[PDB]
């Protein structure tokens, strides 16, 4: 069943990847807000 064991591993790994992507986007958004505030 290691054949499907790897499918589950890939699924969970992409879950982790999506989490990281969302966190990176959020940090970006915050940085944008900061710079946009600063220019004024």
């Amino acid at each position: 069943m290691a054949e499907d064991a790897d499918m589950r591993n890939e699924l969970e790994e992409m879950q982790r990847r999506a989490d990281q992507l969302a966190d990176e986007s959020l940090e970006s958004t915050r940085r944008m807000l900061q710079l946009v505030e600063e220019s004024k």
Partner: protein
């Protein structure tokens, strides 16, 4: 120097001298002069095309300088300023003052501190503003 410049009719230069005088006087814990100078300059600067954008800031300081006197007059002064300069409502300053007033109305020091920390995190605070906020928090 400000009196001389006013006697020379060269505006926008006596203004800066008056702002410096008011800012320094506010440090000495004498608030009436600071309030008067800040409000006078703000009301003068509302009508200027270029300076209009900055006018709001002055009001903020005045209200903060009006905060140490007592809470109630600060609230009523906020109302008076807002009715005269409705755009002032849009600025984060009004929201921050309202939140601080609400927190202090129930002795909720933790909420006041959290709001101050959040605002500083978004934009770094000045030493003058830091000192004024600390002095207010003493109550």
């Amino acid at each position: 120097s400000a009196d001389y410049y006013k006697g020379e009719e060269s505006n926008s230069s006596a203004n800066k001298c008056l702002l410096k005088v008011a800012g320094y006087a506010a440090q000495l814990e004498q608030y009436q002069k600071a309030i008067d100078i800040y409000e006078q300059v703000g009301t003068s600067a509302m009508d200027s095309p270029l300076l209009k954008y900055s006018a709001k800031d002055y009001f903020f300081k005045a209200a903060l300088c009006h905060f140490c006197i007592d809470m109630l007059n600060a609230k009523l002064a906020v109302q008076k300023y807002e009715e005269l300069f409705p755009a002032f409502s849009d600025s984060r300053e009004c929201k921050l003052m309202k939140k601080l007033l609400e927190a202090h109305e129930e002795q909720n020091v933790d909420s006041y501190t959290e709001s101050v920390k959040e605002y500083d995190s978004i934009s770094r605070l000045d030493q003058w503003l830091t000192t004024m906020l600390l002095r207010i928090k003493k109550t």
